[PDB]
Design a protein around this nucleic acid. Structure first.
Lengths: 140, 104, 100, 1349, 52
RNA sequence: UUCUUGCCUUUUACCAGAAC
RNA sequence: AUCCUUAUGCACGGGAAAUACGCAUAUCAGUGAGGAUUCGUCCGAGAUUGUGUUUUUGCUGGUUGAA
């Protein structure tokens, strides 16, 4: 949602967000405001965010506005989310073959939550990677 | 209500005639463990429940025993015999009382 | 908390047929029991019972009779043999003759 | 499309925000979002959204939004449902969502309907009620039906009924391994009922009398994809009452003949059987197939639509009051009128029966009887049933005249569906048609348009719409409609299927119980048809000639259902383990086949679906295994049984077991014998289920035979011997095995059982695929044991199957003793823990991982997958695609540089061997070449491991295999030699180790990058994945044999290899037998002294020989009497059976005999003891007293024969003096009683006494004389005339114990040169058990070390 | 934080068999029994003493 | 792009037809 | 001074259960909560909402491994 999840303004802000949450994990949706898929993701994440407030924070980002982070995906720019812990980018191996970012909408709220939890756990361990409990392959 | 910060603590470590009963209700019991074991080469003993045949009686029945017949040796435990809730118990008591009253 | 199934609700009656692999072990055990000296009689009787339960009503007939014939001379064994043959008259009569 | 709603929500919100760009606006916006959500929620519930403070325009907007959502949402849901029905494409959560949404809308409709009904009264105008009540009453009068009374206080067949009720309730939980809360509660209730039966009965009767207000019923909607709904979860307490009622009324009704012969399902006919019977009846009417005089038979089928859903309760109540005690009826009515809840949306069931109330089936049947009567008319009903005193068997009559009297020849009713077979002489039919025309005009002749027809059949074989026939059919339908009121049930033309057999239409059609049936007489035989395939030959009673064919198909609807089921199984696979999925598939397939047996072979669409379904299932598994799909798996992994480690799919397809995938090998002392490969095909279910025709004929035969046998028995004065019926034991319907089942006389009372089973679809959620045959009343109507056996055979037998798996990796010799820990079990075990969903998911996954590992050597190979053949880190285990689970498993196996360790270990072993045999083979020195750490897993190149110098010179052979007997030593000469320990994780394609060795040797010697010193040497290749070896290279006299020996030993022994094997086992969760029962140990020693009754048994002293030996040890030979020490540690009794020496005279194989004797004695003892005093645990001192004892203790299955890790000190029964004396002085077999705790149990505890005994006995065992001395320190302390021990005081006893302990410990010190300090635990161990101690073997130690590093 | 007393396991004649914190449970079986029985008596005695 | 077939399970790319 | 009833407080002992037990700047409650019913009437104390734990809290002991 627009009202529920906090959205970030400029790259500096994003960077700050990524750094500052020492305790929690940081989920940044990078997505163009008016897109379908991105919107869906935002909706999903709104639900999740409240649930997982204690372990992971969600933030949104208009990717056409903040062009600082086209290092993060090599100028492909689909509607994505990204995961961070202690300023270290967090890799999550789905079926997708892009282990860096989930660039696909997952419809199950619970599933999303579970994956978030998994990544948090990985971060805590220190494991940069983590294998998701859900295979995907189909969404991509 | 927030999901708890997932930490994976294994702190507890307890036991006690007291505590081991409760936990017995949530333990897999020895017969269940046996059942979960399946003999390798053999076709495993199933039971044909009319609802569904699927059920694996497993290696709870001893080979020889299985060949011959059945067992109440796999009816061992008393510590996990489905007790009622507090509410349910109360309700049943009430019902009993009512019945008694009717009888009088 | 998804409680454990009340142990004594496990499935009991109407099972699968006794496996060949399974039966063989039992047979071996019974052979051991028998061959390692006669009981005198009961070993044979036990075997017969097993066969009945197993189940089998031909091999048992073949073997039990043989067992009865050589070493033992007990009533119980004879009775068992008789029971085994519910082929009404002739066999039973023969058994009786042998026994009395 | 589902996004649309979201978009709307967003957009609306944005608009609202725009409208109010105020101060503190964000908060306001947030609030408004919640409001928006809440309105939607309310709508979903079907609660009104009437917010008081809300300002008008905003409220209006919100309302509009919700309306929009509804428009989008409902429609969307419908679309989704349609898609699902089609079998097109749908997301795995989307479907679930739809099911919720769909459920909600169903609820909304139903509740709205109810509301409407409430508003505008019952649809039954009183006239109609009068008519139909009248009909019922007249029928009852005709039948002279004595009404079912209220269950008496001391009712005769009451307890049995109760038991029956409880069992049905239980049935659902019997399978399941855990229980949620509700289930648990239910179980508890059931237990209570059982245990306090009288009380329960009282409660139930009270409820029946008086309870008319009830805890409200929840409706989880079902998941029959093709069409959902409904499952009513009634309160567990009420459920018992309901159950009892159901049992009782049904019993009572059957006794009193409430229900006619025509109503179905009966307890006798399984639905296919019923169908068959119906067909026979149709064939076996008088001159039915004659159409010379213009005759017209018409077989009207129809669903009595909404029958249950528009049962008016008042009317229903009244009807009941005719047939039951009024109180019961009232109760029933009350129950049907409950509050139906659902996920925050209630309604009150004022109208239309609830199907999930346990009795409800009976009620439904009763209701349908009314309708049946209406359909028939009273007179016709009477004719059908016959007189009350002597009723008719289904479709029979008292005469051929009464059969021919009315048009309705045969009538029946399977629940909502009815089946009427009219037979018109031409004129009557014509008249009817005319009447129909008059009522309902037809100028245009557009009546063949609309008319339903069995599109399953071909155009040429299905009902031709020859206009006259069509008219007749329609007329008949109209008549039927007229005969039944609207307000009881909607009989619609759309739902009806009116087949018409005329002069023009030769095929008579109908679809009973999922079978599409097509009757075709012999006198019409030559029209359209190839006569074979999927048929019954209908033979008349009078003639006994083949009268009509009856061609079968599985109904299109049933096919669709099957497809849906398959799809359902496929989706939800995510968590669901491969094995589980496979099982589900099997169940589905078996359900399909066992039911439609004969008919599947005909119906091509169904066959096609099966083909495809199976493939889909296979593909799911494939997908799970790897993201890339394979060229082809072997069928092995799927069709191999569960027990061998496969999935155990039961194929319904022409599957081809490729000749390549039947090869196998065997490592032996002689060598590596191979086998390779007409054509082999996975056997299909088709052959192994016996066609229904055969079954019914068979049934007819064997029942007659049984009857004959019974008669014979009676004649000769005998109970009918179940031994005689073998051969036709597992034959007939019901099976002959039913007659001699142990619960025959109770299952007499379980009447109306089939219908109850059918109606469980409305009560229990997960829907039963074997709804048709209650095994208790029928028996195993199918046997697929043969199929399992045959599958194995097809896959070249067990060995071949194994050779696909990583079985041989585990390094077991044979597979006799092994067992799996199952996956489901594993899942269960770790689902008793505080776990977040992710953890649970992971756990669920784990069973697949194991499976993958098992089949690894035939999942991970070039034939299966293709591409980047990557090397797993630190190993020679090449993957063939990231089979991720498999990879993980491999990593786990080869953790801590395992491969390297193995290789090095092998090298070391080889070196040692060489050292051992230097001088014999003319070896100067054996140098282990220092290699690069990565050498063990260099598969591209290689290197020498063990360089070897000659004393003088070696004449070596041409390079050859290790098992080649013909070797000449005149080829080449050499001073230096080398050994290469090579490893590989082979896979089914590339696992001939010998071949590999040959190749590698050929390459690596000639290749320049592989730096070996000499050109002559040997490559020993050790295949890890199959635990095989072969050496290829140059041999010098005497070496080859040595090498072979080493290999033989190395594979047995090598610690690294053993470790690897262990790891593999762990991964797979295979384990060696050992013993199933739990050992008594230091851990569970305290378990002995609970309230459960126990018995220790000792066979150590049964055959004693003696070689008499004094303190010096002078020789003297003899053979004394024995004993069987059997001790109760609670009571202190000692059932000492003294075995006399006369037993052993003229006997051989003595030890074995002794064990058996002991077992027999134990059995006898057990028999002697009453049921109260009998033991729970027979503890046995010696290891292998279990088997004989077990054999002898089949009769007492409640008894659990435990071994023990305690070297328990009952061996020293003969050290005890009095006991010894008695043993000596017995002249025959004699059972003797002693209190081994003579006095102590009045003073001290049982446990204490036992401990004391242990202390003393142990001491005695250690040093008898010393022990004796200790005992008799003070001569004043007297042993009594009836005691075994000296009557000490407590202090004295303590002192004695101390002394005993000292003796034990000093003795130990003397023996095992060990310091007497230790730990207290150690001390305890030494006393109680005298157990082995944690004494891991050298090999074990080595393994441990390896693991550590 | 105080460590002013220390809580010992409350043995009985049913716990007797399963308590191993205090040593001598099989080693000195009658001694152990005496200890446990004695302890029980003390507990009972203490109660009685308190009442008095 | 939408609908219908077939790969099937996803990305291409297709299988083979309609509509814009 | 002896014996007993009631409640409570402390405790010996024995038993069951923890799907249970709390907590609240909450809302309402013998000026009626919630229920019964043979319909005449009867019982009469919590209910609602929020929320914390709840396959468990606090402490011990052993084997073990770790190495």
């Amino acid at each position: 949602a627009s009202v529920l999840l906090p959205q970030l303004r400029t790259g500096w802000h994003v960077d700050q967000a990524i750094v500052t949450e020492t305790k929690r994990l940081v989920v940044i949706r990078f997505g163009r405001k008016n897109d379908r898929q991105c919107m869906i993701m935002d909706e999903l994440l709104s639900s999740i965010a409240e649930r997982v407030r204690n372990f992971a924070v969600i933030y949104l980002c208009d990717i056409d506005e903040v062009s600082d982070f086209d290092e993060m995906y090599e100028l492909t720019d689909p509607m994505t989310v990204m995961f961070f812990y202690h300023n270290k980018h967090m890799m999550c191996d789905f079926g997708t073959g892009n282990n860096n970012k989930l660039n696909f909408i997952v419809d199950d709220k619970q599933e999303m939550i579970d994956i978030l939890e998994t990544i948090f756990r990985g971060a805590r361990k220190n494991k940069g990677l983590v294998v998701s409990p859900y295979d995907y392959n189909h969404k991509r | 209500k927030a999901l708890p910060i997932p930490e994976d603590q294994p702190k507890k470590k307890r036991a006690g005639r007291k505590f081991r009963k409760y936990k017995e209700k949530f333990r897999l019991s020895h017969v269940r463990q046996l059942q979960n074991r399946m003999e390798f080469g053999k076709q495993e003993q199933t039971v044909l429940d009319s609802y569904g045949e699927e059920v694996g009686l497993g290696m709870s029945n001893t080979s020889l025993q299985q060949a011959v017949g059945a067992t109440s040796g796999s009816r061992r435990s008393a510590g996990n015999q489905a007790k009622l809730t507090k509410v349910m118990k109360h309700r049943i008591s009430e019902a009993n009382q009512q019945a008694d009253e009717f009888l009088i | 908390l998804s409680y454990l199934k009340d142990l004594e609700n496990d499935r009991v009656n109407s099972l699968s047929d006794a496996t060949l692999e399974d039966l063989q072990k039992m047979r071996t055990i019974l052979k051991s029991y028998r061959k390692a000296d006669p009981t005198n009689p009961q070993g044979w009787i036990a075997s017969a019972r097993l066969e009945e339960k197993a189940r089998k009503f031909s091999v048992a007939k073949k073997i039990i009779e043989n067992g009865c014939q050589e070493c033992p001379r007990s009533s119980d064994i004879w009775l068992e043999n008789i029971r085994l043959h519910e082929s009404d008259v002739h066999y039973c009569k023969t058994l009786v003759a042998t026994a009395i | 499309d589902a996004y649309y709603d979201l978009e709307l929500r967003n957009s609306v919100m944005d608009d609202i925000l725009e409208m109010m760009p105020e101060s503190i606006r964000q908060k306001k916006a947030r609030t408004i979002l919640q409001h928006l959500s809440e309105a939607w929620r309310c709508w979903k519930a079907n609660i009104p959204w009437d917010v008081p403070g809300m300002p008008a325009p905003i409220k209006k907007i919100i309302e509009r939004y919700i309306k929009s959502k509804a428009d989008a949402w409902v429609s969307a849901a419908h679309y989704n449902r349609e898609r699902i029905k089609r079998g097109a494409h749908v997301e795995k959560t989307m479907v679930k969502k739809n099911l919720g949404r769909l459920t909600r809308l169903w609820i909304k409709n139903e509740q709205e309907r109810q509301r409407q009904i409430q508003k505008n009264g019952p649809e039954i105008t009183p006239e109609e009620a009068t008519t139909i009540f009248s009909v019922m009453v007249e029928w009852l009068e005709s039948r002279s039906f004595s009404p079912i009374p209220f269950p008496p206080l001391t009712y005769k067949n009451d307890t049995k009924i109760l038991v029956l009720a409880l069992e049905d309730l239980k049935d659902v939980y019997a399978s399941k391994v855990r229980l949620n809360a509700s289930e648990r509660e239910e179980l508890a209730l059931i237990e209570e009922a059982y245990d306090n039966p009288h009380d329960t009965l009282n409660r139930i009767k009270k409820y029946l009398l008086t309870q008319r207000v009830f805890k409200p019923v929840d409706i989880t909607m079902m998941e029959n994809y093709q069409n959902i709904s409904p499952v009513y979860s009634v309160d567990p307490l009420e459920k018992i009452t309901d159950a009892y009622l159901d049992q009782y009324l049904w019993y009572e009704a059957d006794q009193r003949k409430l229900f006619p012969n025509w109503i179905k399902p009966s307890d006798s006919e399984i639905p296919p059987l019923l169908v068959y019977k119906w067909t026979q009846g149709i064939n076996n009417l008088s001159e039915i197939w004659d159409v010379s005089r213009g005759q017209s038979a018409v077989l009207l089928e129809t669903t009595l639509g909404e029958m249950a859903e528009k049962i008016d309760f008042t009317l229903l109540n009244r009807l009941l009051r005719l047939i039951v005690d009024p109180n019961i009826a009232d109760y029933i009515t009350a129950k049907n009128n409950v509050v139906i809840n659902f996920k925050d949306m209630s309604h009150v069931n004022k109208y239309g029966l609830i199907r999930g109330l346990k009795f409800a089936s009976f009620i439904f049947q009763y209701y349908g009887l009314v309708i049946d009567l209406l359909l028939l008319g009273q007179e016709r009903a009477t004719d059908l049933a016959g007189p009350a005193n002597n009723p008719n068997e289904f479709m029979q009559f008292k005469s051929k005249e009464v059969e021919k009297a009315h048009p309705i020849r045969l009538y029946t009713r399977y629940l909502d569906r009815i089946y009427m077979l009219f037979h018109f002489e031409e004129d009557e039919g014509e008249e009817l048609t005319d009447e129909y025309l008059a009522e309902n005009p037809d100028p245009n002749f557009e009546n063949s348009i609309g008319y339903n027809n069995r599109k399953c059949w071909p155009k040429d074989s299905r009902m031709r719409l020859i206009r006259q026939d069509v008219n007749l059919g329609r007329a008949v339908f109209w008549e039927i409609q007229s005969r039944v009121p609207t307000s009881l049930t909607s009989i619609k033309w759309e739902n009806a299927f009116v087949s018409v057999y005329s002069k023009n239409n030769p095929n008579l059609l109908f679809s009973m119980c999922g079978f599409e049936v097509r009757i075709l007489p012999r006198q019409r035989m030559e029209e359209v048809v190839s006569n074979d395939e999927g048929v019954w030959d209908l033979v008349d009673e009078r003639t006994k000639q083949r009268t009509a064919k009856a061609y079968l198909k599985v109904s299109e609807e049933e096919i669709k259902k099957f497809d849906s089921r398959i799809r359902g199984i496929l989706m939800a696979s995510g968590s669901t383990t491969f094995t589980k999925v496979a099982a589900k598939w099997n169940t589905s397939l078996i359900s399909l086949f066992t039911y439609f047996r004969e008919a599947i072979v005909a119906t091509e669409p169904l066959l096609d679906i099966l083909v495809k379904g199976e493939t889909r299932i296979q593909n799911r598994v494939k997908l799970g295994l790897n993201s890339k799909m394979p060229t082809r798996f072997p069928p092995a992994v799927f069709y191999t049984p569960k027990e061998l480690g496969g999935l155990g799919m039961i194929s319904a397809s022409h599957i081809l077991i490729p000749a390549s995938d039947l090869s196998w090998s065997k490592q032996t002392d002689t060598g590596i014998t191979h086998f390779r490969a007409d054509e082999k095909l996975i056997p299909t279910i088709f052959r192994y289920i016996t066609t229904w025709e055969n079954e019914f004929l068979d049934s007819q035969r064997v029942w007659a035979e049984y009857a004959t046998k019974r008669q014979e028995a009676i004649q000769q004065n005998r109970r009918l011997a179940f031994e005689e019926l073998e051969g036709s034991w597992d034959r007939g319907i019901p099976r002959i095995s039913t007659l001699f089942q142990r619960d025959r006389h109770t299952l007499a009372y379980d009447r109306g059982h089939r219908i109850r089973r059918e109606f469980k679809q409305y009560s229990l959620e997960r829907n039963s695929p074997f709804w048709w045959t209650n095994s208790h009343h029928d028996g195993k109507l199918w046997n697929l044991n043969a199929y399992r056996t045959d599958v194995i055979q097809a896959l070249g037998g067990i060995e071949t199957i194994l050779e696909h798996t990583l079985f041989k990796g585990t390094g077991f010799n044979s597979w006799e003793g092994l067992f799996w820990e199952k996956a489901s079990g594993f899942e269960d075990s770790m689902q008793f823990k505080k776990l977040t969903h992710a953890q649970r998911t992971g756990l669920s996954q784990i069973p697949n991982r194991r499976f993958t590992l098992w089949w690894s050597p035939t999942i991970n190979r070039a034939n299966v997958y293709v591409g980047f053949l990557v090397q797993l880190d630190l190993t020679g285990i090449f993957l063939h695609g990231k089979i991720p689970t498999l990879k993980i498993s491999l990593i786990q196996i080869f953790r801590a540089h395992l491969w390297q360790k193995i290789h090095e270990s092998i090298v070391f072993d080889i070196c040692q061997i060489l050292d051992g045999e230097l001088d014999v083979l003319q070896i100067e020195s054996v140098t282990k070449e220092t290699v690069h750490p990565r050498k063990s897993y260099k598969m591209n190149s290689s290197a020498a491991d063990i360089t070897m110098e000659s004393v003088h010179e070696w004449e070596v052979s041409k390079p050859s295999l290790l098992h080649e007997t013909n070797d000449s030593f005149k080829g080449l000469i050499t001073n230096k030699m080398w050994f290469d320990v090579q490893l590989r994780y082979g896979d089914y394609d590339s696992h001939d180790i010998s071949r590999y060795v040959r190749a590698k040797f050929l390459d690596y010697t000639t290749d320049n990058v592989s730096m070996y010193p000499s050109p002559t040497g040997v490559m020993i290749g050790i295949d890890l994945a199959y635990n095989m070896y072969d050496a290829y290279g140059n041999w010098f006299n005497g070496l080859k044999p040595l090498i072979q020996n080493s290999m033989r030993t190395i594979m047995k022994a090598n610690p690294a290899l053993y470790v690897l094997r262990e790891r593999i086992r762990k991964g797979l969760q295979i384990y060696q037998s050992s013993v199933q029962e739990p050992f008594l140990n230091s851990s569970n020693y305290a378990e002995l002294f609970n309230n459960d009754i126990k018995l220790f048994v000792d066979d150590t002293n049964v055959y004693r020989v003696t070689v008499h030996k004094t303190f010096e040890g002078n020789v003297a030979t003899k053979a004394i009497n024995g004993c069987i020490f059997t001790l109760n540690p609670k009571t202190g009794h000692l059932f000492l059976k003294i075995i006399h020496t006369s037993v052993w005279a003229g006997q051989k194989r003595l030890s074995q005999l002794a064990k058996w004797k002991t077992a027999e004695e134990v059995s006898a003892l057990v028999r002697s003891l009453p049921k109260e005093e009998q033991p729970k645990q027979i503890i046995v001192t010696r290891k292998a007293m279990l088997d004989p004892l077990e054999v002898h203790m089949l009769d007492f299955p409640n008894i659990a024969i435990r071994p023990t890790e305690l070297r328990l000190p009952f061996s020293a029964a003969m050290s005890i003096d009095k006991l010894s004396d008695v043993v000596m002085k017995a002249t025959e077999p004699q059972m003797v009683l002693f209190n081994i705790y003579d006095d102590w149990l009045d003073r001290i505890s049982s446990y204490t006494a036992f401990s004391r005994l242990t202390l003393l006995l142990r001491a005695l065992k250690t040093n008898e004389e010393s022990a004796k001395m200790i005992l008799l320190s003070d001569p004043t302390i007297t042993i009594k005339s009836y005691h075994l021990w000296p009557s000490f005081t407590d202090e004295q006893w303590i002192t004695i114990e101390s002394q005993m302990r000292d003796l034990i410990l000093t003795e130990y010190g003397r023996k095992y040169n060990v310091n007497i300090s230790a730990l207290t635990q150690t001390e305890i161990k030494d006393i109680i058990l005298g157990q082995n101690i944690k004494a891991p073997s050298v090999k074990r130690q080595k393994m441990a070390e390896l693991e550590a590093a | 934080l105080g460590l002013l007393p220390k809580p010992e396991p409350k043995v009985k004649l049913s716990n007797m068999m399963s308590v191993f914190e205090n040593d001598q449970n099989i080693t000195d079986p009658t001694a152990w029994e005496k200890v446990v029985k004695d302890q029980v008596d003390l507990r009972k005695r203490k109660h009685l003493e308190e009442n008095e």
